[PDB]
Amino acid sequence: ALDLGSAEAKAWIGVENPHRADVLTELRRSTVARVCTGRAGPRPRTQALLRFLADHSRSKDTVLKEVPEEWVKAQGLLEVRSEISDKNLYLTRPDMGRRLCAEAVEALKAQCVANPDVQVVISDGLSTDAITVNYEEILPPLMAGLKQAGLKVGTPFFVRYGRVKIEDQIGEILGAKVVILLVGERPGLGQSESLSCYAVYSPRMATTVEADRTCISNIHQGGTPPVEAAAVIVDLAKRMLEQKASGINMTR
């Protein structure tokens, strides 16, 4: 018996006649990459191929799963969506995901502050597990760090079916100087918890290039921990207000 999703299956060494088997254990634990699985001629071994296909079956399900509406109320956020209606349309229309819907603009100017210094926006993006798993570990300290010896903090809200360039419209509707976007990257084969952070200083739908944004990616338990992340975005946020710039326009 063997569960392909088990740690024993993840730590499996398939090299038949190793030169130094103790080194193979050292190398396998040194990375999440699927190393040391051996070979059958020039082809992958059966168990390694099985764990590949098994992990892929799970990854395809993490694409179409959505965050429940009961989970977003337990965090006290405004339920706003873009022009996209369902998950199938979001995967094929990236242009509609970069723009809010009609009833979205009327809820931002009404239930949020005017001209904040830092604006924290959250969206599911391409992965739901990237949001739910790390939410409670990155948001409490992010909002506290921006008010501990910080400045004018904006009102947080959740954008459903959102992309990255949608923060350019938020940066004008709310008029924020710095907009922080926590969005889920596309799911990997082995995991889907990876979260990113897209920040920009004073975005403008007509002139902001993607190079003007600063990106903090791979925020998860295997990459940058959410608590450690949260601290480095607050620092990032302070540097944008000082140098009046973002992305490639910064220094250091």
């Binding site: 090299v15 006649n17 190793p18 030169h19 130094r20 088997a21 080194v23 193979l24 190398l27 396998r28 040194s30 990375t31 999440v32 990459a33 699927r34 190393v35 040391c36 699985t37 051996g38 070979r39 001629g41 020039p42 082809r43 992958p44 390694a48 590949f52 296909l53 992990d55 892929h56 990854s59 395809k60 993490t62 694409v63 995967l91 094929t92 229309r93 990236p94 242009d95 391409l126 990257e185 596309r186 799911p187 990997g188 084969l189 082995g190 990876s194 290039v209 993607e210 190079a211 990616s217 791979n218 998860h220 295997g222 990459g223 940058t224 992305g247 490639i248």
Partner: protein
């Protein structure tokens, strides 16, 4: 020129060259998203016929972006050999396709002919080519470059070792390097996509790669796929320089979206010649892929195939060691399923070899796309028969930080032994001296990273 044809008694009218180029493409989800695709299978064939009867001058004089408004267009236009253009300016696109496919057309014939072409003309020929046309045509157009390894020689097949990590952990990066070398991967480049983009981290990643290279005297070159500005600064400060990388787009607006100017690529060329540890004359590395122009809003109503060909006319000016499209890196909104990704892979490689660049391909797909690993194995072998210069290499193709699946280390060994292809001749001698390869085939002790210890 005619913008009109009659098919089964039906007149199909097209507005300009830009619309004909778009609607002549095989069906793909990106052209639909761009609103430039044909409305029916009949109009698509009609666009192909209209395109086939247009001349080289008709497409050379009607680029998708104006000269005075786009530096990439100017670069493509200024580099054309006008003597070679005048010889073919009146050929139809139908006659240029037959010229390329002809067995009486030698490699030296194409070497001069391609100088009279522009990227729009390169895309035009691919649009009227079938899959076997794109494969056979690209095969007879080899492009050979040389860094510390020679790449593109017919009968050879290289591979990029791609040891990416979620935290740029050098222990994880080095582990994937030993794993790749044990399969014969790495003659193209040992290139890492970095997590954090700072000079200190790039140097740490570079010292890790070159520590392995120097310890075993590996004939190859390292690279960190960060921004070109931070790569130049790192090498200027003493980091070991191999290949200098930059992601490119086919428009001036697209380059601005990437934060790249043409002068940066000029500086990278001069920095490589002064600092880089390269025996050959080629040291630059570019990555491309359909959909990048439309993603940046910088396609100007042009289809993604034509925009991708413009990448090659831009890359050709800087004579890089390697270029590869990342065929299915983005998502299903630009390339939906297996059919589209394979087609795009054959298109990109054919257009790259037609443009005279050392064209490879990252046979890959995403998890929100209608694809699996059997797709990558189909495409990598089709492209291998096409003479594809190199593919990628990761442990089973699982990229733990870029969230996609490329080709495995096993795949390059499979392709080489299946098709009787060798690695780069310099790298093959190292593999032989390491006991990893004999007569182009993996030894019994190959595939074991513990052999380097």
């Amino acid at each position: 020129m005619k913008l009109k044809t009659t098919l089964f008694g039906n007149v199909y009218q097209f507005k300009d060259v830009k619309e004909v180029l778009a609607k002549a493409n095989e069906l793909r989800s990106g052209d639909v998203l761009a609103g430039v695709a044909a409305a029916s299978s009949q109009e698509r064939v009609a666009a192909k016929q209209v395109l086939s009867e247009m001349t080289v001058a008709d497409i050379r004089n009607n680029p998708v972006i104006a000269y005075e408004d786009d530096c990439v267009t100017r670069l493509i236009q200024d580099d054309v050999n006008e003597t070679a253009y005048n010889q073919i300016k009146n050929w139809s696109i139908s006659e240029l396709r037959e010229y390329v496919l002809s067995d009486e057309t030698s490699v030296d014939d194409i070497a001069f002919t391609r100088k009279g072409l522009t990227s729009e003309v390169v895309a035009a020929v691919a649009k009227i080519c079938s899959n076997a046309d794109l494969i056979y045509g690209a095969k007879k157009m080899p492009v050979i470059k040389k860094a510390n390894t020679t790449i593109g020689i017919p009968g050879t097949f290289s591979a990029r070792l791609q040891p990416n990590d979620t935290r740029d952990d050098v222990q994880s990066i080095a582990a994937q390097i030993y794993e790749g070398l044990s399969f014969g991967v790495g003659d193209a480049v040992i290139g890492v996509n970095p997590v954090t983009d700072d000079v200190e981290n790039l140097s740490r990643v570079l010292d890790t790669i070159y520590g392995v290279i120097d310890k075993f005297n590996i004939p190859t070159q390292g690279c960190v796929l960060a921004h070109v500005t931070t790569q130049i600064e790192a090498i200027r400060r003493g980091a070991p320089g191999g290949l200098i990388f930059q992601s490119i787009c086919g428009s001036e607006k697209g380059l601005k979206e990437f934060g790249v100017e043409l002068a940066m690529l000029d500086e990278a060329r001069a920095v490589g010649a002064e600092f880089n540890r390269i025996a050959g004359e080629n040291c630059l590395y570019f990555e491309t892929g359909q959909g990048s122009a439309l993603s940046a809003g910088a396609n100007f109503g042009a289809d993604q195939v034509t925009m991708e060909a413009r990448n090659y006319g831009l890359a050709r000016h800087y004579d890089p060691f390697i270029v590869n499209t990342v065929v299915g890196f983005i998502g299903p909104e630009y390339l939906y399923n297996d059919r589209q990704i394979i087609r795009a892979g054959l298109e990109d490689h054919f257009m790259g070899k037609l443009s005279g660049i050392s064209m490879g391909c990252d046979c890959c797909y995403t998890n929100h796309a209608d694809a699996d690993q059997n797709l990558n194995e189909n495409l990598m072998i089709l492209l291998a028969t096409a003479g594809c210069n190199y593919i990628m290499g990761m442990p089973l193709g699982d990229d733990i930080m870029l969230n996609y699946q490329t080709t495995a280390f096993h795949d390059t060994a499979t392709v080489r032994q299946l098709l009787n292809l060798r690695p780069s001749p310099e790298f093959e001698r190292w593999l032989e001296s390491m006991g990893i390869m004999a007569n182009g085939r993996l030894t019994k002790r190959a595939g074991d990273p513990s052999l380097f210890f």
